[PDB]
């Protein structure tokens, strides 16, 4: 695994903008967003949010982060 765990990809990349204390992006923690949605936003990017290619964040790490996000309160 490229980032090891889903918590790792979140702490190293996503959380820098998404963690509630930062606030550049909306909270993703425990919102139940589908994996297929999280994959399209990361691969296409969304307005202010940049896109990450597979070389940076692969499909497998995307599944892991999607699962880590759902499991939180």
């Amino acid at each position: 695994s490229q980032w090891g765990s889903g918590k790792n990809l979140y702490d190293k990349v996503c959380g820098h903008c998404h963690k509630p204390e930062v606030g550049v992006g909306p909270v993703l923690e425990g919102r139940g967003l589908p994996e297929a949605y999280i994959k399209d936003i990361v691969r296409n990017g969304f307005r202010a949010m940049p896109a990450f290619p597979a070389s940076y964040v692969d499909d497998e790490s995307l599944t892991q982060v999607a699962e880590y996000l759902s499991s939180l309160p």
Binding site: K12, V22, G23, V24, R43, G45, R47, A48, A54
Partner: protein
């Protein structure tokens, strides 16, 4: 579908076949769905204009040599990226429609971090985040220098574009020492001391012997950087960040002139950032929509109200002090007495603005700890439209008033804001303006493109030129520097890249031009 300029479908297919045989199937990307994330741009133009034909991922130098060999055979234009986080400058997308992307993100090995000699030798894909973890895990007494993208960006790519940071090692290219490039003919060239067998001085002595060519490769298309070394600041025992808030907009003239001798004598060793209200606001995560919904720019009235509500000034300066407690206390007295004699601005310390933003992020940027807080600037108007317009001037206060009025006038004409900061270095001052707009709105997008052209025209007339610009305006900016320069640049290009495969168009260098 999307094809390189001058290459036929059959010739492109032979090339993609050879790319697969060399790299594997999962390292060659030709489908729209896997190519789409490279296309994301904040430039006022449709994606189709900077859409790549393919994307290959190399992991070794031998593979890069293989890629250029194949590219020479079938005249395939290749655009090289490292971490590809060049927001406001083109992102990861090519300069011209149809080029293949050489994505070196996977070539991510930290080769050596010497904690005694204080240097690092890394590969293209290494991010500042990756480096910070390694430094924190292994307890190395070194400090890192970077800009806002920090965590997700990298040393190699930022330096190839001659980017800047906020620590005393903030002038990144000045701290670069030794690089390895693979030339268009497949040859592996090492600058400085790297060509000497058995040497341990590649990241120690910059120049070497004979012409020193590191600079020839930065902001150019004469080679693909595969390894790069740079100097790291030893971690000081004491770090002292501070802020000085200023109420009136006209104060900028006296601030710069008072700060220059302190910055030139190295009393304030890091680059002094003096941020405008709107920059300060976007970084503290305030949006325009929560203050006014009126069309056009943000009026002086609401900027004055934003200042009242938050306590932020017209100009907010951030700087830092490093060294031993004794040398910090002494430099603190010198800095304090200059602000007292001026009778303007209030000093905000680490004690007062504790865990408050924007102080917290700037303090982190000045001490090499990563955070992406400044990305709030893209939330000011939203929509994902952002271009950097940054001219250079003398670190003279009269230059602030001159350039500000010029910028503000052209920005307001097109309904855009003056979101800017001055980064004062010993003699040079950078006027970093973020022309922010809504890219989803086709009308605002067409005005942003027009605003950008006019900012270049207006500034060029008064003798100012930018030193880094987005892919769309790269050929235009090349014109600001004159014809002889362009003639010399194309002469070297014909010599090292006869087949014009190495990123044609980068910085206005393309063999299809008449120079």
């Amino acid at each position: 579908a999307v094809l390189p300029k001058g290459v036929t479908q059959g010739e492109f297919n032979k090339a993609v076949q050879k790319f697969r045989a060399l790299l594997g199937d999962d390292n060659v990307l030709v489908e729209s769905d896997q190519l789409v994330p490279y296309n994301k741009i904040m430039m006022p133009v449709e994606n189709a204009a900077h859409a790549p034909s393919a994307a290959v991922t190399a992991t070794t130098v031998e593979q890069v040599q293989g890629v250029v060999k194949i590219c020479n055979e079938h005249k395939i234009p290749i655009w090289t990226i490292s971490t590809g986080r060049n927001f406001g400058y083109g992102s990861a997308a090519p300069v011209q429609r149809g080029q293949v992307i050489l994505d070196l993100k996977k070539m991510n090995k930290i080769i050596k971090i010497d904690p005694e000699m204080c240097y690092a030798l890394v590969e293209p894909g290494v991010t500042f985040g990756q480096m910070y973890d390694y430094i924190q895990e292994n307890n190395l007494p070194v400090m890192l220098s970077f800009s806002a993208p920090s965590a997700i960006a990298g040393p190699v790519g930022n330096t190839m574009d001659r980017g800047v940071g906020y620590t005393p090692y903030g002038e990144h290219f000045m701290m670069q020492c030794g690089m390895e490039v693979v030339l268009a003919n497949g040859d592996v060239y090492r600058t400085g001391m790297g060509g000497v067998p058995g040497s341990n001085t590649w990241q120690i002595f910059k120049w070497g012997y004979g012409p020193t060519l590191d600079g020839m490769f930065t902001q150019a298309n004469y080679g693909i950087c595969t390894k790069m070394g740079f100097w790291l600041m030893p971690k000081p025992p004491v770090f002292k960040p501070f802020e000085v808030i200023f109420e009136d907009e006209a104060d900028i003239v006296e601030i710069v002139d008072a700060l220059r001798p302190l910055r030139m004598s190295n009393t304030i060793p890091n680059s002094v950032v003096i941020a405008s209200t709107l920059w300060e606001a976007g970084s503290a995560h305030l949006t325009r929509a929560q203050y006014t919904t009126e069309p056009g720019h943000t009026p002086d009235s609401v900027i004055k109200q934003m200042q009242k509500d938050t306590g932020m000034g017209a100009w907010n300066l951030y700087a830092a002090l490093y060294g031993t407690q004794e040398q910090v206390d002494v430099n603190w007295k010198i800095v304090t007495d200059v602000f007292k004699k001026l009778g303007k601005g209030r000093i905000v310390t680490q004690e007062e603005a504790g865990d408050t933003q924007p102080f917290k992020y700037r303090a982190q940027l000045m001490s090499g700890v990563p955070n992406l807080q400044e990305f709030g600037l893209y939330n000011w108007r939203g929509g994902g439209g952002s271009m950097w317009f940054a001219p250079v001037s003398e670190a003279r206060g009269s230059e602030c008033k001159k350039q500000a009025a010029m910028a503000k006038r052209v920005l307001h004409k097109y309904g855009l804001d003056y979101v800017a900061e001055f980064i004062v270095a010993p003699r040079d001052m950078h006027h970093v303006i973020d022309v922010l707009y809504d890219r989803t709105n086709p009308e605002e997008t067409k005005r942003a493109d027009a605003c950008f052209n006019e900012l270049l025209d207006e500034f060029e007339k008064e003798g100012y030129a930018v030193y880094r610009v987005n892919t769309r305006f790269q050929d235009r900016v090349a014109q600001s520097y004159g014809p002889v320069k362009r003639k010399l640049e194309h002469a070297i290009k014909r010599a090292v890249d006869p087949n014009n495969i190495l990123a044609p168009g980068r910085s206005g260098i393309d063999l299809n031009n008449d120079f």
